[PDB]
Amino acid sequence: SMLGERRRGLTDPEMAAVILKALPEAPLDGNNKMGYFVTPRWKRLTEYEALTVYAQPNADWIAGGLDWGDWTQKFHGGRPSWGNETTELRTVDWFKHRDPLRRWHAPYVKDKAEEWRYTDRFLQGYSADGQIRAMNPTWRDEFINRYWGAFLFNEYGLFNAHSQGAREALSDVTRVSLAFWGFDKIDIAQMIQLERGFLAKIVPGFDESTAVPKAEWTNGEVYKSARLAVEGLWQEVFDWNESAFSVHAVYDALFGQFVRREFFQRLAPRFGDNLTPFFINQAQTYFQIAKQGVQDLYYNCLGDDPEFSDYNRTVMRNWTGKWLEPTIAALRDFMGLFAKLPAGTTDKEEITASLYRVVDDWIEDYASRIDFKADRDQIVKAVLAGLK
Amino acid sequence: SMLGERRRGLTDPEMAAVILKALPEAPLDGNNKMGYFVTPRWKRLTEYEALTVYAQPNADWIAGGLDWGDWTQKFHGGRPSWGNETTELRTVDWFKHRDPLRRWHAPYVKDKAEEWRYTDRFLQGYSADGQIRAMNPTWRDEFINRYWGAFLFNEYGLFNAHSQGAREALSDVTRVSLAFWGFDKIDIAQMIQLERGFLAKIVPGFDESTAVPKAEWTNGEVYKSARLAVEGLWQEVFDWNESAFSVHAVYDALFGQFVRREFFQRLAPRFGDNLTPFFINQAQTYFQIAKQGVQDLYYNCLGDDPEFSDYNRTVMRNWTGKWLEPTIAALRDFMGLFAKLPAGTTDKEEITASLYRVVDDWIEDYASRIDFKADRDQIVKAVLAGLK
Amino acid sequence: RAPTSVNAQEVHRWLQSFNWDFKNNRTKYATKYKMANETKEQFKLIAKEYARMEAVKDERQFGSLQDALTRLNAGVRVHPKWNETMKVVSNFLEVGEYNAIAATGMLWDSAQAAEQKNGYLAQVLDEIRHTHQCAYVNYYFAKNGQDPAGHNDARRTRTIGPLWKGMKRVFSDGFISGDAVECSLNLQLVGEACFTNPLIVAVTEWAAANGDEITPTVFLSIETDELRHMANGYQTVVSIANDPASAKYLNTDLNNAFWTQQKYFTPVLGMLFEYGSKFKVEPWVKTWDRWVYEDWGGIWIGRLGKYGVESPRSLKDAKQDAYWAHHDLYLLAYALWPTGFFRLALPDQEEMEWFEANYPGWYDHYGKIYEEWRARGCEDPSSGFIPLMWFIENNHPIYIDRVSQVPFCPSLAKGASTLRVHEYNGEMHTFSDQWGERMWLAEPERYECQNIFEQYEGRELSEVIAELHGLRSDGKTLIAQPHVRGDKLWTLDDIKRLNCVFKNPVKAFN
Amino acid sequence: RAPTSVNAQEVHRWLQSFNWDFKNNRTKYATKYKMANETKEQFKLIAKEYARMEAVKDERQFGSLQDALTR
Amino acid sequence: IGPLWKGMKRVFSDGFISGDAVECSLNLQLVGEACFTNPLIVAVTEWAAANGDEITPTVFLSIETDELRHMANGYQTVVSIANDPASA
Amino acid sequence: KLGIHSNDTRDAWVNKIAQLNTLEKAAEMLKQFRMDHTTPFRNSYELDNDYLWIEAKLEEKVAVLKARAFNEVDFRHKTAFGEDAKSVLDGTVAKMNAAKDKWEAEKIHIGFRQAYKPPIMPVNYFLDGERQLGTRLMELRNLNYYDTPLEELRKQRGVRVVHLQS
Ligand SMILES: [Ca+2]
Ligand SMILES: [Ca+2]
Ligand SMILES: [Ca+2]
Ligand SMILES: [Fe+3]
Ligand SMILES: [Fe+3]
Ligand SMILES: [Fe+3]
């Protein structure tokens, strides 16, 4: 029927009348602000904070929790649903962290959806404008298809390294940040494949299969140590903070930044490739977005904790030393890729300068924050040994 | 008050009861499809067509109009509000046009808004990632600030060329497309300035003032013929179709596509510049968007008009030859810019390859459409003669 | 140069190949099962496309909430009783949504096939979305409604009451504590497929009936994501079907999961629906039989029969205990009304008729008791009476199930009444059924949750409420109330004068 | 390397200098008045920010229409 | 078909575009918009709500948000010619 | 002073903990505390309402002391008691795989947590153990889960049946 059978209390005369009759003259409390009891990070409480903080039902025995008592059902053996035992780091309050971008689910998918549509428009305009004509064949079929392709597995592995933190994070704000850092990594891996699939459409004979890039990753030399490091970060680390910290404040900050920015982004343009740089722009924006969150959690909240500052820095220094070695080895093996380039593409001085840029940014954005004594020339010299 | 004093017919018991009592048992017409009388360009009528087609109140004496009679108020002298007299082109129906992208206001601002926000995140990532480091000091301080900036006045001029069409267009579908073509042009001009303003924020001595880039455009040699051609297409053409056709299917398809793509985009990378290409991607995505519209209107609609096909093609072939010369001249003056490039940057072989790409594309997308037999070699040679 | 692009399915085609082999590529969590390496997923999504489809839903949802609904004053024109029900419904579901995040993160870790991992991942993101959506309902009602208290601080005021504990069992710990497969059953195969999917829709119905258009706008949007989660749970069974351990443990884990979920939701949902509303949609008993029996217990579970899956063995007892469970529970929730973060009301004359009509014998038992409590002045502050006092005077102890956390009064309940009391290593334990009893006897270390009587023992009522912030912004009026009217609200002083001191009812046993 | 960007105002700042003088740089329509070539506008908008502020209004509007109001 | 349409075209079609641009500006922004449309749009939503129409308010109120800028253009049109002797 | 989140018991333990100034003393006190107040096998239920919170405060102290006492390698691979974590893990897993029944199994898993829960054992090894021990425990426990009647199960667990109602 035009009106339907279901009567709604908001519009149905009889029902609405009953409802209006029972209403009070004014609200039964003038405090109309959900989360009013949350300590604001900024001037005023944000929608991000109100909707997120304390969503996690921790009891007071997990630093910062407002509930009381044990969990209702634990694991066989007795392990708690969430507990202090899942990470070496300690704090006065696990709910202090704040994503500087204040990303809750809505803003997060809104931005990514915009990027998705921008991307679609970009590729249509790129193919319609026939820019693929100016791209060097060798760079396209060798370095983009095989080597940039293989890097997808690196980003995929880093994505997976976040699975345990998703399950074990000790607060809502940390869980959400960690989840978004991880989701951006799988996105990048899928954008690398998206590019290959796009090339297979506008380039006769370009095979979008992952067989080649995967064979490079699993059995090649260029990415051997990168893969060994990724396999470790993902499957040998059970501590959710060691995982997130080592991925973003050590491995991806050094190895990842070098590959994406100092190799592919730096050299792609030299071969008439304006396609890959488009996707790398996204990965770098994502990297910089995650960095703000990582810095807030590990430096602002944990490394500067009024009670466990010294302890947490000792632990993070430990982790940095532990993972710096495998990361250097990853960069060292990657140096082998430079010998595959056409003579005259780049030289030892450019490569060295680019390594120092990555190491110097790392010392500034990360190492220095916990007083880790990094020796920049020693790190670079160890990596350069991989140049063939 | 909690309830407010204003009573609403949808929720107020008394008022809603009265409204419900007056409703018919069922809709008084089963045809709930607005614009059902419009001839669909595709399988089923689209929201784009329903909301746009026939909004313009033209009478039947203006090919396609559904109304009758003369206008109610005309200009002093008797000139009609809208009339066949404002353009040489003739047609069986001015409402035949259909934007292939089916853009009405909503989808249009949504797409551009996403790009605006994408752009903001990009610049925030670019800066935080310190990618400016790989930027060649010469290129940025001389070729972007002066020559890239000066080009903004070229886009700004093409933009203004749309003003008369915004008033004289003989149908809604053409008015909307026209308005969007011009709006995108001003957007590009403003993005050139934005990049210069960005550089000013991340490059200590960089000055964003248009003083430099303007002096060049006004009193320069590189864009001298450019400015002269722009001033003509804009302030000397009183025919809204000649202005749109000549600007999009001639001057911008040749000169614009060369200056944007075959120069700044093709060389920006070589100087460690991924910034300028980011914005050129937009200008090119926008160019490809407007192109689908320009083609549908002047070729699929007018060029192939069941009754004025030959007549219109003759008018466009005429217009082509008319502006092809001033355009070729604009290119010549632009050639003298390579001589200012650091020796070794590019040779006459490439400059020739690019020129042909532009000319060839132009022939496959426009010229061949109105059967304007043009000679690729003669054109390229005529422009190549500008190499100082 | 024909405009071309690439879509999600075109990239997803190769997603399965993303994972590679290496010695330690294995799940970090304990499990009795082995998920097939080639298990596939039902939907071919990638991060970008997932984001786009959810962003589209968000625009309609928030657009409706911020614009039309606000102009219509929809946050206010809701029945007082339903405004209270949503404080519980939305905040409690929020925790289920939240834990489901950690739950699917754990399943994603378990799955070895890239595609199966991806299915779980999409849910992890959806559960963050759902947490934030449920949060928004409370956020919206707090901002624009008739009573913000409870809506504005449930995350801390829910800790005062007993109904919250059971919620954490089925929708918190039940989702993440145990064998990953066991958790998947509690969350997807039973939790969502049996209760959440039908519940979310049912909630929008009761809401619309009571003038609430806020909840339908958010929950109907949440509902659009459930299909994919249903497939995850279904694919979980498939991935482990060809494993020898499956035939040995699957049905046991399923039966436990089934009882766990039903034990809490059977009485709690029916209670919030029938007692937390003015306009009724359907009697809970028939709603239950359709969900648990017909839909789930027969149709949905029958499909997975080819994988060894059988119908839960406790299903029959669950039915026999359902009919009166919610009625039995409201008696307790109302008696303990001062421990809540919401306002409760006695059934009105029209409601009692409806109850008696749909549940013959309701009046002679519950009806008379409510009438008695009214006479004692349970709604009036100066009466000095709290229904709890009535339980004491009439020797009707209230116990807390050690496993499910569901409160029960065996001497008064019309449904189940089988109390079991055990002593083990210096501690007393109270059970309400034979299924939860087996759970504790077999897995004592999994169930050590202290109940409210144990934690509150020897404490004066008003002191507990004050300490846990159960007060309105004036610092004197209680959030919880025994009636939903606008005047004569109880203050902390009214409760203090009652001088009610909690006692652990199990200490009476020798 | 602090995150940086540029807003509509910062660009509109130089909008007035976008037009240059020349021969036929004048209106094509009959008029009896002369509009000062130095006239300013109250709102400092650029094409991209204009689109954004309108797209936000659209979201709410169409969201209310397609969802709640239709329900 | 009807006569009411003719008058609408006179004020909101031809009155907007046929004549001296300044006269058109006055018909549109100085009078039409500032005097009639601006208040009208809001009034319509008021009459609409009273009659059960929540559709029109949702759309028209959004349109209303844009009028402030158009008011400025009309106001700025007079400021732009206030110095030209032709004005007086 | 008796409260849920703040009370004399908790205060008294905060003071006791502030006096544990050496790793060995603190670590031993933590292990003793777990034997006395955690799991269904705890020596007593006197601190049932505050032990969870107290245990975490004790853990905090042991962690801070261990980080200051151990060099980087030992912090990653040794227990607070100086044992090689890998050896302890492999040894306990070995015992678990040799368990003859679910009753022997639960004793091994529960005892492991009581003695080695972080900060005693490094978290990486401890959670790897949780993964392995929990798997075997469940396998043994869920086999023929319903075959034993309640009457007999009560006797196997060894509870004292205080009151039965039907
Ligand atoms: Ca090697
Ligand atoms: Ca050199
Ligand atoms: Ca005794
Ligand atoms: Fe959900
Ligand atoms: Fe779900
Ligand atoms: Fe207007």
Considering only CA atoms, give the Rg of chain E. 16
Which phi-psi region, left, alpha or beta, contains residue C401 (left: φ > 0; alpha: ψ -120 to 50)? Answer: beta
Q: Per-domain residue ranges for chain F? A: 2-69, 70-142
Please tell me the number of the ligand nearest to residue A347's CA. 2
Ligand 4 geometric centre to CA of C98 (Å): 8
**Residues whose CB falls within 8 Å of the CB of residue A275, separated by 6 or more in sequence, listed in order:** A126, A131, A132, A135, A144, A195, A198, A199, A268
Q: And the tokens for C161?
A: 């009451």
Nearest to residue B39, comparing CAs of B50, B47, B55? B50
Rounded Cα gap, residues C347 and C344, in angstroms: 10
Q: List the catalytic residue out of C134, C378, C409, C500.
A: C134
- 3-state class (DSSP) for residue B142: helix
Structure tokens at A310: 């010294």
The C-alpha atoms of residue B38 and residue B95 are separated, in whole angstroms, by 10
What element of type H or E holds C380? none
Taking each helix axis as running N to C, give the angle between helix A211-219 and helix A149-160, from 0 to 180 degrees, rounded to the nearest 10: 70
In chain C, the residue whose alpha carbon lies closest to the alpha carbon of A238 is C28
CA D58 to chain centre: 17
Q: Is C134 a catalytic residue?
A: yes
**Is the four-CA dihedral C188, C191, C196, C198 of positive or negative sign?**
positive
Write the CA distances from A268 to A158, A185, A195, integer angstroms. Answer: 24, 21, 14
Enumerate the domain spans of chain B: 1-388
Nearest to A75 by CA among C319, B328, F141, C399: F141
Task: Reduce the DSSP state of residue C407 to 3 states and report it.
Answer: strand
Alpha-carbon distances of F154 from A78, A112, C435, F108, F162, rounded to whole Å: 20, 56, 13, 21, 11
Q: Which amino acid is at C420?
A: R
Using alpha carbons, list the distances in angstroms from residue B222 to B139, B338, E34: 16, 10, 47
Question: Which CATH number is B1-388's, of 1.10.620.20, 1.10.3720.10, 3.90.1150.10, 3.30.565.10?
Answer: 1.10.620.20
DSSP notation for B194-226:
HHHHHHHHHSTT----SHHHHHHHHT-SSSHHH
For residue C55, the one-letter residue type is A
Tell which residue, C474, C463, C161, C186, has the closest CA to residue C332.
Answer: C161
**C118/C120 Cα distance (integer angstroms):** 5
The strand pairing partners of C196, in sequence order, are none
Q: Which of A79, A103, A105 to mutate to test the interface with C (most CBs of C within 10 A)?
A: A105
Residues 6+ positions from C325 with CB-CB distance below 8 Å:
C266, C267, C270, C415, C416
Distance A347 CA to ligand 2 centre (A): 6
Q: Contact at 8 Å (CB) between C89 and C135?
A: no
What is the CA A13 to chain-centroid distance, rounded?
53
**What's the CA gap between B115 and A125, in Å, rounded?**
14
Residues 6 or more apart in contact with residue B354 via CB below 8 angstroms: B258, B261, B262, B263, B266
- Cα–Cα distances (Å) from F147 to A355, B278, C63, F158, in that order, read 66, 70, 57, 18
Beta strands C407-408 and C399-400, pairing class: antiparallel
Phi-psi region of D59 (alpha: psi -120 to 50; beta: other; left: phi over 0): alpha
Calpha distance B327→B331 (Å, rounded): 6
User: A225 alpha carbon to ligand 1 midpoint, in Å?
Assistant: 8
Distance E41 CA to ligand 6 centre (A): 11
Instruction: Return d(Cα A273, Cα B76) in angstroms, integer.
Output: 59
Type and span of the H or E element at C342: none
Annotated binding site of E for Fe cation: 33, 67, 70
CA dihedral A80, A81, A82, A87 (to 10 degrees): 70
Q: Is C76 on the interface with B (CB under 8 A)?
A: yes
In whole angstroms, what is the distance from residue B113 CA to residue B118 CA?
Answer: 8
Size of interface C-E (CB pairs under 8 A): 7
**Paired residues of C477 in beta bridges:** C491
Q: What does the block give as tokens for C244? A: 């020898």
Residues from chain C that touch D66, judged by Cβ atoms under 8 A, are 60
Question: Number of H helices and number of E strands within chain A?
Answer: 16, 0
- Supply angle C-alpha B384, C1, C5, rounded to 5: 135
Ligand positioned closest to the Cα atom of E70: 6
Q: Which residue has the tokens 């810019």?
A: B337
| Helices marked H in C41-162 | 47-66, 68-71, 80-110, 114-144, 154-157
Task: Supply the DSSP symbol for C343.
Answer: B
Using CA atoms, how far apart are residues C115 and E10, in angstroms rounded to an integer? 65
Token pair 């490039």 in the structure block, residue: B341
CB count within 10 Å of CB B66 equals 12
**How is residue B190 annotated by DSSP?**
H
> Is the sign of the CA dihedral C377, C379, C383, C385 positive or negative?
positive
- CA-based nearest distance C202→chain B, Å: 23
Using CA atoms, how far apart are residues E6 and C437, in angstroms rounded to an integer?
85
C64–D64 C-beta distance less than 8 A: yes
Distance of CA B367 to the CA centre of its chain: 19
- Dihedral (C-alpha) B264, B266, B271, B277: value to the nearest 10 degrees? 60
The CA distance from F116 to the nearest CA of chain A, in Å, is 10
Nearest CA in chain A to F120: A85
Test mutation, E5, E8, E10, E18, chain B, max B CBs within 10 A: E18
Domain of residue C381 covers 1-510
Q: Are C315 and C258 in contact (CB under 8 A)?
A: yes
With tokens 């006791």, the residue in question is F16
Virtual torsion, Cα B300, B304, B305, B306, nearest 10 deg? -120
How far is Cα A112 from Cα C129, in angstroms, rounded to an integer?
A: 14
The whole-angstrom distance between A135's CA and the closest CA on chain C is 15
Q: Could you tell me which of C505, C510, C470, C506 has the C-alpha nearest to residue C491?
A: C470
Nearest to C136 by CA among C229, C50, C222: C222
- B72 in contact with E at a CB cutoff of 8 Å? yes
d(CA C416, CA C432): 8
Interface of B with A in 87-126 (CB under 8 A): 111, 114-115, 117-118, 121-122, 124-126
Task: Name the DSSP letter for residue C451.
Answer: P
Write out chain E residues lying below 8 Å of D36, CB-based: 80-81, 83-84
Superfamily assignment of F70-142 in CATH?
Methane monooxygenase, gamma chain, domain 2 (1.20.1280.30)
How many CB atoms lie under 10 A from the CB of residue E4? 6
Residues belonging to chain E: 88
Distance, in Å, from the CA atom of E28 to the CA atom of E71, rounded to the nearest integer, reads: 10
Count Cα atoms within 13 angstroms, Cβ side, for A334: 30
Q: What is chain A's length?
A: 388
For residue C52, what are its two tokens?
Answer: 């786009």
Ligand with smallest separation from the Cα of C120 = 5
Contact call for residues B84 and B62 (beta carbons, < 8 A)? yes
Task: Report the C-alpha gap between B90 and F88 in whole angstroms.
Answer: 92
Tell me how crowded residue E36 is: count the other CB atoms within 10 A of its CB. 13
User: Token pair for residue F98?
Assistant: 């040799």
| SS3 letters across chain F | CCCCCCCHHHHHHHHHHHCCCCHHHHHHHHHHHHHHHCCCCCCCCCCCCCHHHHHHHHHHHHHHHHHHHCCHHHHHHECCCCCEHHHHHHHHHHHHHHCCCHHHHHHHHHHHHHHHCCCCCCHHHHHHHHHHHHHHHHHHHCCCCCCCCHHHHHHHHCCEEEEECC
Q: Which residue of C has its CA nearest to E49?
A: C72
Sheet holding F160-164: strands in order across? C427-431, C420-424, F160-164
Q: A337, A328, A341, A279: which is closest to A120 by C-alpha?
A: A279
Distance from C-alpha of C135 to C-alpha of C123, rounded to nearest angstrom = 18
The answer to whether C229 is annotated as binding is yes
Cβ pair E55:D42 closer than 8 A: no
Beta-sheet pairing, C407-408 with C420-424 = unpaired
AA identity, residue D15:
L
Residue type, A218: T
DSSP-derived 3-state class of residue C400: strand
- Compute the distance from residue F162 Cα to the ligand 3 centre, in Å: 9
| Residues of chain B found within 8 Å of residue C77, distances taken between Cβ atoms | 11
**Any residues with CB less than 8 A from the CB of D64 and at least 6 apart, and which?**
C63, C64, C67, C68, C69, E58
H/E stretch holding B364: helix B348-365
Q: How far apart (Å, rounded) are the C-alpha atoms in residues C148 and C472?
A: 9
User: From CA F7, how far away is CA F15, in angstroms rounded?
Assistant: 13
Q: Is D37 on the interface with E (CB under 8 A)?
A: no
Q: Please, what is the end-to-end C-alpha distance for chain A in angstroms?
A: 79
Burial F73-94 (b: 16+ CB within 10 A, else e): ebbbbbbbeeeebeebbeebbe
Partner residue opposite A239 with nearest CB, options F39, F75, F124: F124
C-alpha distances (whole Å) from A246 to each of A223, A316, A319, B385 are 19, 9, 7, 60
Give the best residue of E22, E45, E66, E80 to mutate against chain D (max D CB count within 10 A).
E80
Please report, as a single letter, which amino acid is at residue B181. Answer: W
Tell me: is residue C97 an annotated ligand-binding position: yes
Q: Is C41 annotated as a binding residue?
A: no
CB contact under 8 A, E72 and D33: no
Query: For residues A67 and A60, is the Cβ–Cβ distance under 8 A?
Result: yes
- Distance from residue B233's CA to the centre of ligand 1 (Å): 63
A32, C142: Cβ pair inside 8 Å?
A: yes
CA distance linking residue C150 with residue C481, whole number of Å: 11
CA–CA dist C51, C60 (Å, integer):
15
Q: Is CATH 1.20.1280.10 correct for F2-69? A: yes
Tell me, what CATH number does C98's domain have? 1.10.620.20
Helix (H) / strand (E) containing C417 = none
Under a CB-based contact definition with an 8 Å cutoff, are residues F117 and A85 in contact? yes
Largest CA distance in chain B: 86
Please report the DSSP string for C295-311 in residue order. Answer: IIIIIIHHHGGGGT---
CA C236 to chain centre: 23
Phi, psi for residue B225 in degrees, rounded to 5 = -70, -25
| Residues of chain B contacting residue C59, judged by C-beta atoms under 8 Å apart | none
Name the closest residue on chain D to residue B232, using Cα atoms: D24
Contacts of B130 in chain A (CB under 8 A): 357, 361
Interface test with E, best of D33, D62, D64 (most E CBs within 10 A): D33
Put simply, whether A11 touches B (Cβ < 8 Å) is yes
Which of B2, B11, B288 lies nearest to residue C72, judging by beta carbons?
A: B11
**Enclosing H/E stretch for A70:** none
Pick from C324, C506, C329, C303: nearest CA to C424: C506
How far apart CA C14 and CA A211 sit, in angstroms, is 10
Distance between CA B214 and CA D70 in Å, rounded? 54
Residue in C159, C88, C164, C166 with CA at minimum distance from that of residue C401: C166
Smallest Cα–Cα separation from F148: which of C252, B386, C118, C275?
C252
Q: How far is the CA of A365 from the centre of ligand 2 (A)?
A: 29
Buried b (16+ CB within 10 A) or exposed e, A342-377: eeeeeeeeebeebbebbbebbbebbbebbebebeee
Radius of gyration of chain C (CA): 24
d(CA A376, CA D11): 41
Answer yes or no: is C130 a known binding residue: yes
Please state whether beta strands C427-431 and F160-164 pair in parallel, antiparallel, or not at all (unpaired).
unpaired
Q: How far apart are CA C103 and CA A73, in angstroms?
A: 14
Q: Which two tokens stand for residue C353?
A: 């008729």
Residue carrying structure tokens 């080639």? C38
CA distance B198 to B190: 12
Non-local CB neighbours of B323 within 8 Å, separated by 6+ positions? B229, B232, B233, B246, B250, B251
Residues 261-290 of B with CB under 8 A from C: 288
Q: Report the alpha-carbon distance of residue A212 to residue A141 in Å, rounded.
A: 11
Around Cβ C368, how many Cβ atoms within 10 Å? 11
- Cβ–Cβ < 8 Å for A40, A102: no
- Name the 3-class secondary structure at C480: coil
Nearest CB to F123: which of A63, A85, A310? Answer: A85
* CA atoms of B250 and B367, how far apart (whole Å): 9
Number of residues that this document lists for chain D: 71
Q: Where are the alpha helices (DSSP H) in C276-402?
A: 284-288, 301-303, 315-335, 349-358, 362, 368-375, 387-393
The crossing angle, in degrees rounded to 10, of helices B105-128 and A105-128 is: 100
Encode C199-219 in three state secondary structure: HHHHHHHHHHHCCCCHHHHHH
- Check E14 against B6: CB less than 8 A apart: no
Q: Residue A300 corresponds to which tokens in the numbers above?
A: 């602002």
For residue F22, the distance in angstroms to the closest alpha carbon of chain C comes to: 32
* DSSP β-bridge partners for residue C471: C478
